[PDB]
Amino acid sequence: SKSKLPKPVQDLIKMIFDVESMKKAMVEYEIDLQKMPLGKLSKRQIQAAYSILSEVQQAVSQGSSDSQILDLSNRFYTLIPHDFGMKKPPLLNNADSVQAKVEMLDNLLDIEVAYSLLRGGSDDSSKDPIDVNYEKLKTDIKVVDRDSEEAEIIRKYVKNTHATTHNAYDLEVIDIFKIEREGECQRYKPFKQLHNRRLLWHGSRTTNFAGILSQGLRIAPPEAPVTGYMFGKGIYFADMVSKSANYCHTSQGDPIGLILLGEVALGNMYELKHASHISKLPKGKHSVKGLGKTTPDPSANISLDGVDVPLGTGISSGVNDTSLLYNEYIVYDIAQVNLKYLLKLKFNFKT
């Protein structure tokens, strides 16, 4: 049998479960596909390299010698085979060297989630593989009509929050999906009535969406170093579409990406101007608002199904000495997010 699902839904299911895209991401990460193939990828190996990556960071900012650093850098490449042939692996002597590797392991974990959904389960050639894979996501995906309503808010949000400093590409909304993860509304119940509930952006590689749609937006594991992130381990969001879009890691050789819209219950925000590698929020706070120089016009804030949408054009926030050009929002409890929409975007590069 053939799939009765709409074509935009089918193309989304093909895109996210692409085994060759998963392999392509792993080569970009310099991983030896002979010693660490796609099917031989494991959660406990990634957890183990995270612990050694925490040990590298523990020594980089503790002013350790380049010889004490080397031993720890080499130990990381032992647990995660990198394809460098018979050459010594690049040394991980700086802070950005480590964050890149902590980000690689976050993306490797969700590739394992995607592949394990696919490789697990049952084999039946009479069923359409697109219909099979869609069911694995345990999510209801519906196409949002362009002549609606909610599609005009979403399109306004995209058109109005593209920053001038992200002018190397333009965006085109290909398809707008309304998404409903099974059990999410119920997980959201303690936060459904909270104050400061906002419709915010979240960008990610297309290789993480089988795990995002199946498991929801998650926080990094305990093995991951908190210093490997600006505001520690939480779920990050932007009010500027282009800030999140930059996280799609789309290029000229891959201009199609996916971005999420989620209802985030922020409540009592712990405003910050500079990096803070927090483990937990201060008493009484529910989120971190990283204050940026530019912010969407607060007078232009709209309401979509009781949630505030910050779709105004960017203006000066009035924030003094801040490390951020634009805002970011971090929640440290997965239950504080309700994924509403999923967009397919075409990145039109000017570069």
Ligand X SMILES: C[C@]1(c2nc3cccc(C(N)=O)c3[nH]2)CCCN1
Q: Of the two residues 80 and 238, which places its CB atom closer to ligand X in the complex?
A: 238
How far, in Å, are 33, 113, 255, 299 from residue 23 at the CA level?
8, 14, 18, 46
Angle between helices 19-28 and 95-119 (to 10 degrees): 160
Q: Of the two residues 21 and 327, which places its CB atom closer to ligand X in the complex?
A: 327
- Cα(154)–Cα(139) distance, rounded to whole angstroms? 20
Q: Tell me if 279 is assigned to a ligand binding site.
A: no
Q: Tell me if 183 is assigned to a ligand binding site.
A: no
CB of 327 to ligand X, least distance (A): 8
CB of 244 to ligand X, least distance (A): 3
Asked whether the CA dihedral 112, 114, 117, 119 is positive or negative, the reply is negative
Q: Of the two residues 133 and 199, which places its CB atom closer to ligand X in the complex?
A: 199
Q: Which residues contact ligand X (rule: CB under 6 A)? A: 201-203, 229, 236-238, 243-244, 247, 328
Q: Tell me if 244 is assigned to a ligand binding site.
A: yes
CB of 272 to ligand X, least distance (A): 13
User: Could you count the other beta carbons within 10 Å of the beta carbon of residue 18?
Assistant: 16
CB of 238 to ligand X, least distance (A): 4
Q: Of the two residues 10 and 339, which places its CB atom closer to ligand X in the complex?
A: 339
Catalytic residue among 112, 184, 263, 328: 328
Q: Tell me if 202 is assigned to a ligand binding site.
A: yes
Task: Please name the residues in contact with 344: beta carbons below 8 A apart, sequence gap of 6 or more.
Answer: 8, 11, 12, 15, 173, 174, 175, 177, 256, 257, 258
328 in active site: yes
- Cα(114)–Cα(136) distance, rounded to whole angstroms? 10
- Least Cα distance to 75 among 111, 95, 50, 100 occurs for 50
Q: Binding site for NAD(+), residues?
A: 202-204, 211, 218, 244
Q: Catalytic site residues?
A: 328
